Amino acid sequence: GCMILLDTDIWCPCSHPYACPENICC
């Protein structure tokens, strides 16, 4: 998921527990 096309939330807010993909998976 996350870094994969699954949820429209793939672009999770950076500098957060979620944080953006391409590195951190939310």
The 3-state DSSP composition of the chain as helix, strand, coil percent (nearest 5) reads 0, 0, 100
Q: Tell me which residue range forms the domain holding 24.
A: 1-26
Question: Number of structural domains, the chain?
Answer: 1
Show Cβ contacts of residue 17 under 8 Å, excluding neighbours closer than 6 positions: 26
Q: Which residues of 5-26 are buried (b: 16+ CB within 10 A; e: fewer)?
A: eeeeebebeeeeeeebbeeeeb
